[PDB]
Structure formats: structure tokens, C-alpha cells
Amino acid sequence: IYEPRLSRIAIDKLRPTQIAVGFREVELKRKEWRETRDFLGNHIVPVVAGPKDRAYLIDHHHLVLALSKEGVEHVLTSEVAKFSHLGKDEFWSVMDHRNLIYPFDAQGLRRQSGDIPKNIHDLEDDPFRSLAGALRMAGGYAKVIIPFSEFGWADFLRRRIDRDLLSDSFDDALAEAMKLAKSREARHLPGWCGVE
Amino acid sequence: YEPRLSRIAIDKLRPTQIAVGFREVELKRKEWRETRDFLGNHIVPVVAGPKDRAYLIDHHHLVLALSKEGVEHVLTSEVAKFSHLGKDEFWSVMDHRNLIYPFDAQGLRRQSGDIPKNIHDLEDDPFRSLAGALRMAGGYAKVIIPFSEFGWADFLRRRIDRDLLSDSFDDALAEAMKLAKSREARHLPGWCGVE
Amino acid sequence: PRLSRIAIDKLRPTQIAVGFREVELKRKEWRETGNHIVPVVAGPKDRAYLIDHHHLVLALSKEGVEHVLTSEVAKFSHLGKDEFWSVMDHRNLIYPFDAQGLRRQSGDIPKNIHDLEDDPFRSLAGALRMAGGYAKVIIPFSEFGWADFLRRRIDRDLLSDSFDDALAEAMKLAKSREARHLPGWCGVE
Amino acid sequence: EPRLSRIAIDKLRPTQIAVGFREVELKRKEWRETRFLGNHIVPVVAGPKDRAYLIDHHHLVLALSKEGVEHVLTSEVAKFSHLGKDEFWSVMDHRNLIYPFDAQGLRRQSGDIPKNIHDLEDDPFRSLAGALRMAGGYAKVIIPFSEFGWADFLRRRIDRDLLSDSFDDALAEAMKLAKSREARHLPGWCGVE
């Protein structure tokens, strides 16, 4: 019986696997959606079965918060791994070990597993996460297969662009980021894309 | 942020490989037959190709099983879009990315042109069946390398008489096993013996 | 990539613990018997960071080897300390866990090779692989994944007192559906 | 746990058919003033017989060869010496350590891989692709033979004449291309989304 299957869960029941997202990206998703008119072809979101019966969301937090904020109750899911034989301790370890969690808060601090929110509606806003998204969307770096590429870019920017620039003027913060992305200083980042 | 759910008729799915192991197909059939919306149904990865064509990217054993059991459609998920490309380039892109596997039932390389266009035209590669069976018996580990099993099928086809495989499969499996465990097979993915 | 050289006592580790039994075994090879090359990452200062082979490099150190060839596989020396560890972590090139599998912070990663803490479950998982327990694999820190699984299921005391006994137990857990979720699992499906 | 050795570069067996000569000419001029305690180590597979197969860096070794460097350090990173020859190529292909495409992008049998660096064919588009990445039109990436996939995309869209008779027009047309929607599917793509 050869693999993943469609299922269906209440968004209020998904367990997050990261502490933060960029609310700006969330809000853009919510516009797109607010402005589009069976089950074919809604979003499917990948998930892992954890302890008790719980499903842990593995990607697409922005989209899931967007949908949740739009009043959408359910989302299609596909279980891509089954760890429900583990206790909770072991589970988080295995997840951590397999790079399926990202316990970093809105100001980029490593935090413990227990600090990972239990409901989606508790994600924190990481404004550098939004900046790093927009940067990519602008052509500042490439998508790469590395997990949490964006969060790497967000940490780079956060040490280099003033938060006050970012709330004052997003596009000027973006313009800065764009000057930095291209500099030799960002050379060590995944997806880096400039003159050698 | 992106993936959506879709459907095709299986007769419209375009394969990306030439052979499968028919024993493994029959086991998947036997199962399906024996399990109890659209919730519960199988979903398979697919790349958008030239004209409007969906190309199945993994799970050929399952797709053929399902097709041989009469099942008319399957749930899919576009995971890449190359409809902007023309035929030649698409095919080349496909290989550059190892989304294709054009080796025939006797393990020989062929040209994109030789890839079947229905699931129903897949050849039987019996050493691919032996490799699956060897994995399930715990002769080596699953591993994320694409085509791990076919790499094993090749090892075995250089070493185990084809005939033995029809005469006694369990004998072919025991042979496979004693090779899986030895240093001869150490270069293979998922290798699992004494160091 | 091109080739260089440091004193071993100058190499910066990137993990807290290694399996001391495995280290002792590696000695006995090198001892009972084409120099060794080892990948390193250039960080803050000219400074060299060892990205693998801690067991082997420590074994060399304990045998009195002064130096070791090395191959620099990445510069990060334009970064401060902090950004550096952050990057290392994101790149998964650090394993900041101690002898009991406990997450410690990047600053608690030791500065010298002989400051490596001993984890016996790393040693047991080591041995389990060599015995056909599970498959070498591309996943990073794979043996530590196995050491965590064992450490929750085999008495530390049994491990310290009788290694064969622990390994027989580990063998039996390795082939069982409880281990199915681990990298390299090799059991009857 | 790898170890070092050297080989005569004649004795090293290649693993692809083509390199970009413009890229080899470059590595030669750069190399030219610098100035074994810090030489180059290059990754190699131990093959059937005692033969050693170059795993990357053909552009570089060709450059050495052509400045009369005789040996090179090497790190044996895989051992396939227990295999027959036929098996050996097949495992090579399976692990994507060979690139049997000639200077035209055309797929050739593994028999047609040259047995000496000095027979590497010139793929002008490979050189374009190298200069393109260097201009920052796309990005390095963990994927196997990326530059080549970009050679193959440019080879389809910019006639050969512009390459031989004017490198930079060529570089420039390449750049407008690497930023467009048209290249979205390439690894490293970096244009506006």
C-alpha cells in the first residue's frame, strides 16, 4: 500500500513546528486568497504524525496562518512520516535531529522545544523573516534545498539593518537588503548570487 | 504557500521510467484488494510537461498496481512545472535532475524516446523485484538516493543467474541476502553488513 | 580547495562529545600499523574548525601526533563569533550536545580536542553500525541519532559493565519496528 | 577517514568529455603567479585496476597540465576497485559521478569518455555558463553539474557566432536571459518572482 495519502484536519488542531513567521508575508497571502473566487484544488500541507494523535505542520506556516486568519477551518494534509510510537521527549529530539523544527523566536533567539507554540494562532511576527522573503521574491537570492534558507537570510539582515528602518520604510529596508545580498559579505549564505 | 491537489486518469499519466518489478506490483495489488472519500486516497508526485502532460515522478509500482486493479484515477500534486519547455529541452532537463530512469528490464540505458507513454507499457525487471524483496527482508536500508533499488537490481543481475530467479525466488532471495551482507556490496546505498 | 596543516592542539572542535571506546579502537588500528587529511572550516581569526572525524583526530592526539593535514572546505572568517555559530548551526556543522545527549549552547563547545566529553552511547552506536546493525548514511550526525535512541532504552550501568551484553540488546532493538524511524534502519518490513 | 596521495596527471582518468576553454585559460592566468605545503588536492575515486578517476575540477586540472605541472595531490573519496569495468561505469552513472556529454550537449556512451585530461573537448557554452555565474546571474547550488545545465539552456538560445566573435555581447544576452521567467527552472535561478 505504497505511500502518502490524503487527509484533512482542522487548522485549530495542527501543531506548529516553529515560533515565528513574517506577518507581512502572512498578510500578502491573505490578500491573494481574499481575492480568489469539491476538494480539487485546495492547498495540501505536509505533516508528520506525532505523539497521541497529533499532526505537526512541517512547512507552509505562513500559508496556514493566512488561512486561519481568513476564517478557513480545515486544510488538506499528507502525512509524510510517522513518529507516533515515540514519547514527547524523544519525539522532539528526533524532529530536531531531522531538522523539522525551528525553535527560534521573533528576534532570532534559539529557544527550547517547549517554547514552540501549540496553536498556529500563537506564531510570533518575525519582521526580518518578511524582509528575507521579499528579498528573495525580488531576486536577491535563489531558492535552494537547504531547510530554512530564509531564516538564514533573515538572521544576516537582522544584524545589519536597523529595525526602525524596517518599520519606517519597508522598501528602503528592502533596498538595503538588496545592496547587501549582492555584496561579497553575503557570500556564505545559501542561494548567494553576486560577483565573485 | 503553493502545492494544490489534483486528479488525472492513470491512462493519461506519462511514465518517467521504463521497467518495474512485477512481483512488487502484485504484492501492492494483493494489499489494496485487502484494505477496507477522497480522504484516504493515494497521492502521487507529478511534474508538468510539454503540451498539457503530467509526468509521474515516483510510485510507478503503485500506479500500475492501481491501474491493474481497475482504478480509474489517482490524486496528484504538481511539484514542478516545465510546460514552458519544448520536447528536447524538457527531456534533457528531466535527466539533469534525475526525474527520469530510462533503463530497460535488462538494465540497459535507453533514450528518452524509449520511455513508455502508458503505465501499461512498463516492462518487468525481475531483478528489481528481487531488490525490493531483499529490502523488505532487511538486506539493506531505505535511503533517499533516487533509484537506490535499481542500483541494487543491477548488482544482483550481474551475479545471480536469471533462471534461478524463476525457478526458485526464495533461493534467489537467499543468494541476494548473502551478497547483501558481504563486502562485495559495500559500495551500495543502504549497505548494511559487518565492517 | 587546496591543502594545508595545523598542530592538532590548535584545531577547533564543533561537537561536545565522542565515543571514547571508538576512539580507543581507532588508536589500535593506527597503532598496530598516506597521511590523514581532515576537513576543516576557516572561521574568526585564521582559526580552523574541524567538521568531522573527531574520533580519529582525538585518537591521533592521544598517540602523540603533532600535526594533521587538512582541507579547507569553506571560509567564514569575515564573521564575528556570534554570526559564525549561528551560521554553523544553520549549516548543520555543529553538534552542541553533551555526553548525556543534552543540548548545550554553542559557547559550551570545547576549545581543544582533548576537552571532548565521552559519550558511551555514541560508542555503542558506533559498534552497532560495525556489526551490521544499520547502514552508514548521508544524514549528518547519524550515529548520534542512534545513541539517543539507545540511551533511552538500555541501562547506563549495563552498558558500562558489559559491552557485549549491551550490544546484543542494541542489535535486537535495531531490527525491531521501534527503530523504524531512524536513519539507516535495516529490518524486516 | 581519507588519506592523501599524488598522481601523474597523464595517469588520471577524466569523468567528463568537455570543459570550457575560456575558463581553463582563466585559471591559467590566475594560477600564473602563486609563487606539498599548500598545493591542490583534488577528489578522486579508486577504480577498477588501480586507475584513479577525477571527480571534479576538470577545468582546473586541464590548466595545471597546460602549465606543465606533472603531479597533483588527491584524496581518494570512494573505493570501487572490487567491481568489473562494465559494472564500474554503471555505478558511476548511478551516483552521478560521470558527465558523458560532448561539446555539443549531446549524450554519448560512457565508452566515449577520454582517458587522459589532454583530450578534454571545448564546450564554449560551459565557459559562458562559468562567466555567467561569476557575473552573479545565478548561484552555486549542491546539484551535480549545474554549470552544464546552464550551458545546455544557453546553447539553445544564443547562436555560437556570438560566443567566439564577441564574448561580452554573449555574456550580456545571457544575463537578460538568466533573469527572465524563461530560466525559472534552472538550479540557482535568481530572477524576479
Summarize the structure.
Four copies of one chain form a homotetramer. Chain A contains seven helices and six strands; from the N terminus they run ββαββαβαβαααα. Chain A is an alpha/beta fold.
Q: Determine the CATH superfamily of the largest domain in chain A.
A: Conserved hypothetical protein from pyrococcus furiosus pfu- 392566-001, ParB domain
Helix content of chain A: 25-40%
In spatial order, strands of the major sheet of chain A run 1-5-3-4
> The CATH topology of the largest domain in chain A is what?
Conserved hypothetical protein from pyrococcus furiosus pfu- 392566-001, ParB domain
Instruction: Provide the structure class of chain A.
Output: alpha/beta
CATH architecture annotation name of the largest domain in chain A: Alpha-Beta Complex
**Computed Rg of chain A:** 18 Å
Largest sheet of chain A: 4 strands, mixed
Q: What number of structural domains do the residues of chain A give?
A: 2
SSE order of chain A, one letter for each helix or strand:
EEHEEHEHEHHHH
Tell me the fraction of residues in β-strands of chain A, as a range. Answer: 5-15%
What's the level 1 CATH class of the largest domain in chain A? Alpha Beta
Helical region count of chain A?
7
The coarse silhouette of chain A is globular
Please count the beta strands of chain A (DSSP E, at least 2 residues each): 6
List the topology elements:
Four copies of one chain form a homotetramer.
Chain A: E1 6-10, E2 20-21, H1 23-34, E3 44-49, E4 55-57, H2 61-69, E5 74-82, H3 88-97, E6 124-125, H4 127-138, H5 149-158, H6 163-168, H7 170-181
Parallel strand pairs in A: 2-6, 3-5
Antiparallel strand pairs in A: 1-5, 3-4
Helix pairs in contact in A: 1-2, 4-5, 4-7
PDB class: structural genomics, unknown function
Keywords: Agrobacterium tumefaciens, Hypothetical protein, Structural Genomics, PSI-2, Protein Structure Initiative, Midwest Center for Structural Genomics, mcsg, unknown function
Assembly: tetrameric
